[PDB]
Structure formats: structure tokens, C-alpha cells
């Protein structure tokens, strides 16, 4: 089926080395292929490089 959350849901990042750990953002798209890190999340909190988006895996990512 369509793995990952829906197209524009809110989400919580659980990657402990990411800059947005324990922090809430919006999924923008989930790539439906054998990519290791499909889930693309956009934030309002920009990082130290000014990059507001990142790819995450299916398991580092929890709803609400």
C-alpha cells in the first residue's frame, strides 16, 4: 500500500541526532520506493544551515 503518513499531516521527529528531535513539523511527501529515508518533513524552525527540510525514515517518525 501507501507506506508512511498522509500528504500534509503533522508529525513528530524521533531521530536523536537531528536538529528537530522531539519537535513537530509537517510531512510534505512520502516517496513510495525502496529509499532508506522517504519521509520528507518541512519545518518552521530552520536549522543552523538555514535548511528547513530533511528526509527521515519510516521508524524515526511518529504521528501528532
Amino acid at each position: 500500500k501507501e507506506v508512511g503518513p498522509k500528504r500534509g499531516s503533522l508529525v513528530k521527529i524521533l531521530r536523536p541526532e537531528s536538529y528537530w528531535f522531539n519537535q513537530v513539523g509537517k510531512v510534505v511527501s512520502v516517496d513510495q520506493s525502496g529509499v532508506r529515508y522517504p519521509v520528507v518533513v518541512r519545518f518552521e524552525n530552520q536549522n543552523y544551515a538555514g535548511v528547513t527540510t530533511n528526509n527521515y525514515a519510516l521508524d524515526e517518525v511518529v504521528a501528532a
Partner: protein
């Protein structure tokens, strides 16, 4: 000889290769991304470690990564 090791969080946007002022980095096929490419460092003998690669990686907690090792006459950037 500096230690440059990159990781699977690469997305293959090849901004590290274009930013490398010493041709340390090049782009190898790899299926774990949409752009079908992942970097590689076959020329870490020539690296100075100026870290222009990881100023340019977009991914959070940078995919390319430079470890400052033991410095030869090419790593210290010497014309002499």
C-alpha cells in the same frame, strides 16, 4: 591524510562535490535516493579538511563528514 567518511543520509544533490576545492569528492550510483547517486571520496590523500563539503550538505546532521587526521605536505596546503 584526513578521514572523510560519508553516510547513507546522502540524497545525492552533489553540492559537496561542486564545493570541494580539491576534487576529493565524486558521484557514484546508489539506489537509496531519487537522484540515484551518492558521493565518494577516492582522493582523501589530497584533502586539506577545509570542510567546504559539509558547509554545503543540505541534510540535517551533515551527510558528508570530515575527520582531521594526520597532516602531510598536501594536507597542510603548502606550495613549499
Amino acid at each position: 591524510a584526513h578521514i572523510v567518511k560519508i553516510y547513507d543520509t546522502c540524497i545525492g544533490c552533489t553540492q559537496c562535490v561542486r564545493a570541494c576545492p580539491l576534487d576529493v569528492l565524486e558521484m557514484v550510483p546508489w539506489d537509496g535516493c531519487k537522484a540515484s547517486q551518492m558521493a565518494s571520496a577516492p582522493r582523501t590523500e589530497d584533502c586539506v579538511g577545509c570542510k567546504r563539503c559539509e558547509t554545503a550538505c543540505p541534510t540535517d546532521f551533515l551527510s558528508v563528514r570530515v575527520y582531521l587526521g594526520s597532516e602531510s605536505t598536501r594536507s597542510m596546503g603548502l606550495s613549499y
